[PDB]
Amino acid sequence: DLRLHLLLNTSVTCNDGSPAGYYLKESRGSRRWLLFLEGGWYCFNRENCDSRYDTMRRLMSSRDWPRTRTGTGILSSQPEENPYWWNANMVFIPYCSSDVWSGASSKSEKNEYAFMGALIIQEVVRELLGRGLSGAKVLLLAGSSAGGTGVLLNVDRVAEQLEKLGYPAIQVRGLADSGWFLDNKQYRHPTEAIRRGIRYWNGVVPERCRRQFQEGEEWNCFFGYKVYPTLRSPVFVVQWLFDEAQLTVDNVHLPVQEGLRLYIQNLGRELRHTLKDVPASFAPACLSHEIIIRSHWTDVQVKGTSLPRALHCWDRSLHTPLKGCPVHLVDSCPWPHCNPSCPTG
C-alpha cells in the first residue's frame, strides 16, 4: 500500500549513486506524518562496503527496489495491527547509505560510494512538504536498529529544517527503536567501527552533542545515553534490555555459566540505568531485536501496558502524569524473558 517515489533531486543518492527515495501512503485529512528509517547495520571501509554490495545490495542501491511495499506494524493502516497511528500518512525511507543515517558525502573522483543518509532524510522531508506535509501537525521520525540511531542523530536537524523553511507549527518528535546501544566491554575479545565510519562517510552528528565531545570524538554521539540528553525534540526510546545486536557486538552467543550470567545481568542493569531519566521509554526484558514494524508488535507488554498504548499515552502527554496511561515502561526483572510477553521466536 506504500508507493515508491525516487527523489526528484537525483544528486541525493544511495551508496552506488542511484537515486534514494521513499515509499508513501497518504491519508487525506490526517495531519500526522510517520517517517520511518529502515535499519541494517552499516559499512565503514572499501572492503566491507564492497562485500555488502555483493550480497546486501538493496541496502546500497535503489536499482532493484520494488514499486510498492506493504506497511506493517506501526506502518500498518489497519487499526487491528496498528492501534496507535493507523490513520497517519505513512512513509518508509529505505536505508541505502550504510552510514547510520549520518553521511553527507557524494560519490566522486575520491569516493567509490556516496554516504548521504543525513541528506536523504532532509531531501525526503523537502519533497514531502509539496505532497501534504506542509499541513502536518506532528511529524514522527521513527526508525529501527541503525534507523533508530538515525532518529537520534537526525530528529533535531529535521526540526531545524522545518523551522528554517517556515513551518514552525509542525511538531517534530522521534521514536528510536532498537538504536540505543552501549559502548561497553565485550564479553570475549562499535566504537572503532564508528570512528572509522565517520571519516569514511563524512558523518555528521547533532550540533549540541558535537560541541560537547569536539573533533575526533563525534563517535560518542552515536550512543543514545550520550546524545539523548543533548536533544530538544521529544524522543520516545524503545529498547530490548538484551538486544541481540548489542550482544553480537559484545561477542555473546547463546547452560550459561557464572561469568556469562553476570555479564548478561550487568548488561540489562546498565541498560536500565541509562533509561532511568528517559521519561518516554519502553524497555522489555527480552532477548530480541527491533519491534515497531513487526506485525505482532502489539503483543509485548511492560507492567501490563503495550507499546501502542504507551505511544498513545505519549501523544496525550504532549497535548503531570496521566491516570492509567504510563509513558515510562522499563522492566526491572534481570534475565531474558523474565517478562512473559517477550517474543517467542
Curated annotation (Swiss-Prot):
Keyword vocabulary terms for this entry: Glycoprotein, Hydrolase, Phosphoprotein, Secreted, Serine esterase, Signal, Wnt signaling pathway
Catalyses which reaction(s): [Wnt protein]-O-(9Z)-hexadecenoyl-L-serine + H2O = [Wnt protein]-L-serine + (9Z)-hexadecenoate + H(+)
Enzyme Commission number(s) of this protein: 3.1.1.98
Chief location: secreted
Induction pattern: Up-regulated in hepatocellular carcinoma (HCC) with high intracellular beta-catenin.
Origin: domain of life: Eukaryota
An example molecular function term from Gene Ontology annotations: protein-containing complex destabilizing activity
Gene Ontology biological process terms from the UniProt entry: bone development; negative regulation of canonical Wnt signaling pathway; negative regulation of Wnt signaling pathway; protein depalmitoleylation; regulation of bone mineralization; Wnt signaling pathway
Ubl conjugation found in the keyword field: no
Glycan-modified residues: N9
Subcellular location: Secreted
GO terms for cellular component: endoplasmic reticulum lumen; extracellular region
Tissue expression per record: Rarely expressed in adult normal tissues.
Active site per UniProt: S145 (charge relay system), D243 (charge relay system), H289 (charge relay system)
Top enzyme category: hydrolase
Described function: Carboxylesterase that acts as a key negative regulator of the Wnt signaling pathway by specifically mediating depalmitoleoylation of WNT proteins. Serine palmitoleoylation of WNT proteins is required for efficient binding to frizzled receptors.
Name listed for the protein in its UniProt record: Palmitoleoyl-protein carboxylesterase NOTUM
